[PDB]
């Protein structure tokens, strides 16, 4: 319901702090499909900043990976991908920060 | 055109017509810009950039712009064309300077297109000194706009550690 609506029930701001909490939760529940599904969309909404938010969250998420995420966690940063500067850079340095660490530890740092 | 045995002078002529531009009528002047564009082999160039800058003055003027604004942005594609082919000169910097005057969005977006692609382009010296230039615009200044720029020009960096 809440995804469903606040998209067609707007408002940024609830998203930043729905983001935030959600951005903790990720795959202890589950529904991956989903869950990847709203959050796509999320993203989908411009704004360098909403679209942010999903990368955001993820790394709690992505850290723990789900019912099918670790490969295909690694494919995906890959398969979604964005320039436009600084929104360019914000794909390019997350990843560039990713080049940084080894993954799993990268994971560990910036998680904590 | 597809006289495209297309003779040198004639091309030249256009500047004596563009005058008249000045007694606006953008829509008009719009048609001229882009048929102006063409004929130049980046030369006739000059006389005309100088002119260009002339226009330039003559645009600040005093102004009330409201369909000359367009066709600012209009020219600046046109001559953006041609700078790709060119090489081209100081009076490129000014358009700099000229820039930082200036205060709506769309031209910060072609900047923008700037930073992109002289980003490719680098022979960089130029730069430098616009990167200078810039600095004093930088400080002598604040907005969404430059903030954004800092952001970018951050990223690029380079010496004067």
Same mark, same amino acid.
């Given at each position: 319901?809440?995804?469903?609506?606040?998209?067609?029930?707007?408002?940024?701001?609830?998203?930043?702090? *729905? /983001?935030? !909490? &959600?951005?903790?939760?990720?795959?202890?529940?589950? #529904?991956?499909?989903?869950?990847?599904?709203?959050? +796509?969309?999320?993203?989908?909404?411009?704004?360098?900043?909403?679209?942010?938010?999903?990368?955001?969250?993820?790394?709690?998420?992505?850290?723990?990976?789900?019912?099918?995420?670790?490969? *295909? /966690?690694? !494919? &995906?940063?890959?398969?979604?991908?964005?320039?436009? #500067?600084?929104?360019?850079?914000?794909?390019?340095? +997350?990843?560039?920060?990713?080049?940084?660490?080894?993954?799993?530890?990268?994971?560990?740092?910036?998680?904590? | 055109?597809?006289?495209?045995?297309?003779?040198?002078?004639?091309?030249?002529?256009?500047?004596?017509?563009?005058?008249?531009?000045?007694?606006?009528?953008?829509?008009?002047?719009?048609?001229?810009?882009?048929?102006?564009?063409?004929?130049?082999?980046?030369?006739?160039?000059?006389?005309?950039?100088?002119?260009?800058?002339?226009?330039?003055?003559?645009?600040?003027?005093?102004?009330?712009?409201?369909?000359?604004?367009?066709?600012?942005?209009?020219?600046?594609?046109?001559?953006?064309?041609?700078?790709?082919?060119?090489?081209?000169?100081?009076?490129?910097?000014?358009?700099?300077?000229?820039?930082?005057?200036?205060?709506?969005?769309?031209?910060?977006?072609?900047?923008?297109?700037?930073?992109?692609?002289?980003?490719?382009?680098?022979?960089?010296?130029?730069?430098?000194?616009?990167?200078?230039?810039?600095?004093?615009?930088?400080?002598?200044?604040?907005?969404?706009?430059?903030?954004?720029?800092?952001?970018?020009?951050?990223?690029?960096?380079?010496?004067?550690?």
């Amino acid at each position: 319901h809440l995804c469903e609506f606040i998209e067609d029930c707007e408002f940024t701001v609830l998203a930043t702090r *729905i /983001l935030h !909490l &959600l951005g903790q939760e990720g795959p202890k529940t589950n #529904n991956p499909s989903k869950y990847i599904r709203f959050i +796509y969309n999320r993203v989908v909404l411009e704004h360098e900043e909403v679209r942010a938010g999903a990368v955001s969250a993820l790394a709690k998420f992505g850290a723990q990976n789900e019912e099918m995420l670790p490969s *295909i /966690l690694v !494919l &995906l940063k890959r398969c979604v991908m964005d320039d436009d #500067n600084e929104v360019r850079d914000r794909a390019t340095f +997350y990843l560039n920060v990713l080049e940084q660490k080894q993954k799993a530890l990268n994971a560990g740092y910036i998680l904590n | 055109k597809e006289h495209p045995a297309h003779e040198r002078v004639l091309q030249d002529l256009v500047m004596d017509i563009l005058r008249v531009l000045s007694t606006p009528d953008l829509e008009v002047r719009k048609k001229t810009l882009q048929l102006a564009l063409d004929l130049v082999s980046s030369r006739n160039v000059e006389e005309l950039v100088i002119v260009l800058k002339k226009e330039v003055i003559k645009t600040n003027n005093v102004s009330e712009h409201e369909d000359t604004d367009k066709y600012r942005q209009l020219l600046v594609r046109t001559l953006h064309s041609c700078s790709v082919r060119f090489p081209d000169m100081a009076a490129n910097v000014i358009p700099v300077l000229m820039e930082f005057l200036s205060d709506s969005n769309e031209a910060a977006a072609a900047d923008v297109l700037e930073f992109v692609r002289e980003a490719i382009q680098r022979f960089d010296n130029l730069r430098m000194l616009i990167v200078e230039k810039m600095l004093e615009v930088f400080h002598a200044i604040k907005s969404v706009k430059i903030y954004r720029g800092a952001l970018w020009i951050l990223g690029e960096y380079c010496s004067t550690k």
